[PDB]
């Protein structure tokens, strides 16, 4: 009875390396427009990010930064990107290390091997209307394990500002006393529409590029396994989110392994 | 003879490569500076990057209409449909340009985004006969075309005041309390552009991703048609020549030259 309609040829309005279309084959919900699409983190009130170019640790490489003498690699133990820009198979997917990409202070060229996240989105993604979870994001192509997908982009806000945001649905915690969040509620990119999955296929990794202010890592999603075409993308939102939200709604991810469904929570409340 | 001694002085940081040739002498490709493609800071400048402070448009076309708010913040959008300054653009007294930004409703490829889109023309760093390194066009360039930005280290008046080398400074005209770009230590292709008494490019103040009026970004546009091989240059202005004249004199070689040893002698000797 109902057709899949294409309702936006590019929700990023041309701001990404590729267009991100939106389709809806499920209901009458038109293209989401209660937010401003931005491709890189914004600020409302000042974050006082340390941008002093002299504070950048940087490499003195004269090659494409594949030697273990690259200081940038060394700051993360080693450079973790293979030759096609994908995380090495031994990459710690459980506790990813901080990645330091090469920056404007490095001697190397813009096209060295240590610049994956800064080069932006390469895989083809689609915003689509899911059965039970509002909008979601899926792959239009297969994506090998360890490939960079997109960054979690938003408005940088302080601990205190987060405390009083009305909607807490789109917060990402920036990990390291004085702490900050990304809030994608009013300003965000394609990643604000990525759903929680109890069986995730992407992991967030903290990355530094043009600054190395440790209060403000940038959050890069990489696939944690090969992803088949058409699969929904999803990461583990984590307990902070679910401890709060569990009483308003439960997880609809549909996995055998789901630990946040109405069923999982009732089995748990009773196993206690 | 004239050999290519760097394939790209910008190390792939620009949209296009900028080669270095030397057919005049034995000087190697300059390297006493760090090539950057965007302005940098050393000491903190606190640029206002509050997205809510951005004046922005509500267009859902390509921003060609006179109703584009961003266009009006400079009387009119000054760019034709090919991204060139209008013929009637005030080349003597250029107004402030406000390009579209991340707060505008429009698309990234609207018509009000010329400078933020980067270098498009083919430029070359070459060795000149008499003024060290210079920059020249490797193609014809019509009047009103964006060439490159003057990129460097943002610094205060006080800091400029104590800089040993004052050869690479650009004043950011502003209200109260003023800043400079110093391209001495950190710079892009434009640090190599020489002064000409018969100039073929002009600097324009432009705002893009922020609108902190202390820190306009400086875009060079051609002020007439330029032929392949022509040296680019602008008028450095009296402030530079006043300081510099007692050290060296203008070698631009134009009959209009007003800063040569000769021209300076004829004025001292009208006194
Ligand atoms: C309240 N004051 C604060 C203050 C600080 C520093 N952090 C937080 N974090 C936080 C609060 C509520 C959350 O959930 C309702 C939450 O979820 C993070 C994981 C789920 N996100 C959803 C999309 C991006 C990832 C984080 N809240
Ligand atoms: C000393 N304290 C200052 C302080 C401030 C606010 N401005 C300046 N400006 C300045 C000083 C010396 C200069 O020249 C010797 C000069 O040249 C302006 C134009 C020449 N530039 C050369 C490359 C780009 C254009 C500007 N100096
Ligand atoms: C970051 S937004 C994800 C995009 C969201 N689907 C939308 O339509 O905007 C997070 C919100 O999506 C919904 N959501 C995400 N993952 C879910 C899940 N596994 N089960 C149920 N609802 C989920 C909840 O409304 C949650 O607060
Ligand atoms: C911003 S740099 C331009 C690049 C410089 N030619 C170089 O080789 O690095 C300015 C300096 O270039 C030289 N210069 C530029 N225009 C000149 C001119 N018209 N006559 C003589 N020297 C000039 C002077 O040394 C001046 O202080
Ligand atoms: Zn390196
Ligand atoms: Zn590198
Ligand atoms: Zn490096
Ligand atoms: Zn689940
Ligand atoms: Zn507009
Ligand atoms: Zn605009
Ligand atoms: Zn526009
Ligand atoms: Zn002259």
From Swiss-Prot, chain A:
One of its GO terms (cellular component) is chromatin. Zn(2+) 1 binds at residues 59, 61, 65, 70. Residues 57-120 form the Pre-SET domain. The keyword Transmembrane helix does not apply. It is found in: Nucleus; Chromosome. Zn(2+) 2 binds at residues 59, 72, 102, 106. Its main location: nucleus. This is Histone-lysine N-methyltransferase EHMT2. The gene is EHMT2. The chain holds residues 916 to 1189 of 1210 of the full protein.
């Amino acid at each position: 009875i109902r057709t899949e309609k294409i309702i936006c040829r590019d929700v990023a309005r041309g701001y990404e390396n590729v267009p991100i279309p939106c389709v809806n084959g499920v209901d009458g919900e038109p293209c989401p427009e209660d937010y401003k699409y931005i491709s890189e983190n914004c600020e409302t009130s000042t974050m006082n990010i340390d941008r002093n170019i002299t504070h950048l640790q940087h490499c003195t490489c004269v090659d494409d930064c594949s030697s273990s003498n690259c200081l940038c690699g060394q700051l993360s133990i080693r450079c973790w990107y293979d030759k096609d820009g994908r995380l090495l198979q031994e990459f710690n997917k459980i506790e990813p290390p901080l990645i330091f990409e090469c920056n404007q202070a490095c001697s190397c060229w813009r096209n060295c091997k240590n610049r994956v996240v800064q080069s932006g989105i390469k895989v083809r993604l689609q915003l689509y209307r899911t059965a039970k979870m509002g909008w979601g994001v899926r792959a239009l192509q297969t994506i090998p394990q360890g490939t960079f997908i997109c960054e979690y982009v938003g408005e940088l806000i302080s601990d205190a500002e987060a405390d009083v945001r009305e909607d807490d649905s789109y917060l990402f915690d920036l990990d390291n006393g004085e702490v900050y969040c990304i809030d994608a509620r009013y300003y965000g990119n394609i990643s604000r529409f990525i759903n929680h999955l109890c069986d995730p296929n992407i992991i967030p990794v903290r990355v530094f590029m043009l600054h190395q202010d440790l209060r403000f890592p940038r959050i890069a999603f990489f696939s944690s396994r090969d992803i088949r075409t058409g699969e929904e993308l999803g990461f583990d939102y984590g307990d902070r989110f679910w401890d709060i939200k569990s009483k308003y709604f439960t997880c609809q991810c549909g996995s055998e392994k789901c630990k946040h469904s109405a069923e999982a929570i009732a089995l748990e409340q009773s196993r206690l």
